[PDB]
């Protein structure tokens with residue numbers, strides 16, 4: 001009996017669903033066919049409208065306290081909640097309903113974890129992270145915009161294997177993926193340590209792969225697996241391809257000034 | 271209430287049907303229709319059911335940062351907004367990017383096209399044409415034989431292979447946990463494929479799911495990650511170094527470029543051997559069943575900005591040449607100018623926003639985004655529990671874009687109709703799309719029917735293209751064309767680098783101290799779903815206004831001040847439903863637009 005997953009979508013750009021299906025180990029195909037039962041998911045599901053809604057009740061009844069609720073995106077509180085409408089009602093109402101009988105809740109990505117782009121100032125919809133509306137259920141934050149594919153499927157794999165949520169840090173993120181800052185293991189670190197920096201795009205330093213700190217890299221304050229696990233089966237990550245980390249796994253990263261403004265007090269990151 | 275517009279006779283006196291949520295799209299949509307005594311759709315209402323307010327959030331921020339914000343408009347068409355943004359800012363600040371940056375952006379754009387199109391067809395659209403339960407009844411041997419007729423060059427064709435796939439599907443279904451297939455409309459008479467065709471398609475569904483993750487590694491190389499690769503105002507961040515000292519030292523070296531070429535070659539094989547043949551075969555069989563519905567506005571009014579100039583910054587050389595066609599006159603393509611205040615305008619008469627004067631449409635440089643969620647007095651239900659939306663008032667988070675007041679369809683089909691019209695007018699740059707269309711017509715009319723022992727037909731492109739089948743075909747053809755194009759782009763990039771031009775960024779105007787104190791710019795992109803534009807105003811180094819008009823904004827638009835309907839609503843009109851309580855035909859046609867609702871509303 002494969003564990004049912006009800007995958008809800010709030011205000012979102014769907015980057016988290018898209019990342020999920022990039023997973024190479026394990027393949028998304030194998031997750032859906034062999035590991036979970038993906039019973040409700042707007043992106044992929046055959047049923048629509050009334051037939052789709054009916055699935056929620058059926059699973060919540062048969063598998064009470066034994067399904068995982070995955071949330072992509074987040075609920076808005078402004079516009080009476082109707083800046084995200086599902087089945088003619090506010091998304092927040094669907095979220096609260098399905099959450100109540102979940103065994104565990106996964107907050108996919110920075111949207112569900114922190115608010116992400118729609119929650120950036122002045123947050124016209126009052127988009128709100130899941131843990132600020134659902135306060136009485138086991139939640140795990142898997143932040144990033146989106147998270148790395150293998151991090152997403154890694155979390156699912158752990159939860160299925162062990163029937164437990166993995167060890168979390170104080171911010172509710174899995175330590176197995178979010179214990180390191182990008183800057184800890186970044187391959188450009190030897191340049192940082194030697195004060196070798198890119199100062200303008202495509203300068204000689206950039207062509208030599210010098211550190212991107214002075215171009216605004218937020219690696220030194222950002223927890224994620226990008227510098228080691230890397231992206232799309234270990235092909236690259238933002239810094240390897242020449243752009244500074246913009247801090248996309250961290251709470252409120254859209255409102256920490258320009259992405260191209262360097263962190264102050266460089267000495268504190270040495 | 272009933273009225274006529276654009277040759278459609280709207281009537282809301284029939285039975286009301288609601289589809290909410292519409293699934294297998296990106297984002298959130300509600301669709302309502304009315305059907306007559308014979309189950310024919312006589313009214314259709316498109317409601318975008320989400321809004322985030324990116325245009326509001328951008329105000330006051332640094333134009334150099336904008337691309338990263340607007341990229342998060344959509345993770346499916348990931349990067350298309352970033353491209354529009356950097357183009358808009360570069361337009362405003364008079365920045366010319368280096369050739370390598372142009373080519374790398376083009377390669378990234380065309381990679382997105384292929385990934386988006388192929389994933390759409392198989393993983394979002396196919397279940398509207400393909401009955402998975404029927405696939406379980408197929409004979410593996412006859413499936414193998416069908417595969418060899420549909421695509422002789424595809425190597426995965428053995429009876430044993432299809433048998434193995436079928437067996438896993440059966441175990442899956444027999445487990446009692448049907449997952450994404452739960453509560454499906456399987457068995458409906460709306461499904462016309464033979465079992466063998468269904469098994470072939472489901473097989474390719476699984477193949478595509480495994481393969482799509484490889485294609486995007488092109489994004490990862492140039493842009494660090496996918497979804498949401500990085501861009502840069504003034505060029506690209508992926509600096510180039512081929513010397514020995516550039517051995518994994520620089521973002522881009524020859525090894526990285528070789529890797530990219532290998533991915534491109536695989537894409538070209540998939541499009542040619544799997545995607546295009548599948549769509550031709552499925553199209554042919556639904557054509558034979560007489561399902562040529564869903565033309566909507568495609569039969570009259572189509573628009574695209576034009577894209578992919580073989581010579582940078584020279585629009586006459588667009589390889590997907592754009593413009594506007596009206597009234598189904600393919601003999602006259604009007605030029606489209608995104609700078610012209612009288613051309614692209616957005617109304618909000620029936621949208622949840624407010625203007626100073628809502629009797630007029632605003633050009634995006636003068637655009638305004640102020641939310642106004644309010645329901646008409648004839649709504650059934652309440653503000654937070656809608657039973658039946660009131661389309662006489664404001665009924666969507668999507669604005670209503672029009673061109674010189676006309677409602678237009680946008681997307682691959684529009685681009686292919688435009689390319690065909692250009693080609694006939696003597697435009698050589700459109701030769702390849704024309705060739706694709708003529709090839710496809712012959713396959714659908716004659717070649718595939720003969721192969722399958724079916725009657726030959728004699729539909730012209732004029733008759734065949736404006737349809738849900740045509741819309742689906744055009745998307746596949748565009749994927750193929752894009753793969754072919756970026757193959758050439760790769761060669762041009764490598765040639766330029768080896769000639770000694772390694773520049774990837776123009777930083778002359780990177781610092782805001784160099785900017786004009788006021789500026790306006792526009793960037794346009796041929797996004798996977800159609801015509802995308804970003805319009806920016808800059809003042810004292812900050813964003814004064816930022817307005818997006820996005821392909822699904824056009825297609826999914828609600829009615830305008832004149833009461834004209836948009837592409838979604840037009841496409842559903844005049845379509846019979848087998849069972850009003852199963853939205854199979856509604857989904858099939860809506861999905862043929864590849865609706866991106868997060869895009870549409872931003």
Ligand code: NFU
Nearest residue numbers: 344347798799822869
């Ligand atoms: N509509 C839309 Fe997107 Ni998610 C844009 N621009 C694209 O193809």
Ligand code: SF4
Nearest residue numbers: 183186211212217219
């Ligand atoms: S500042 Fe950024 S590029 Fe430099 S070593 Fe740290 S993480 Fe790497």
Ligand code: F3S
Nearest residue numbers: 224226245246247248
């Ligand atoms: S931008 Fe995000 S993808 Fe990793 S390198 Fe920084 S946390």
Ligand SMILES: [Mg+2]
Nearest residue numbers: 669817818819
């Ligand atoms: Mg807009």
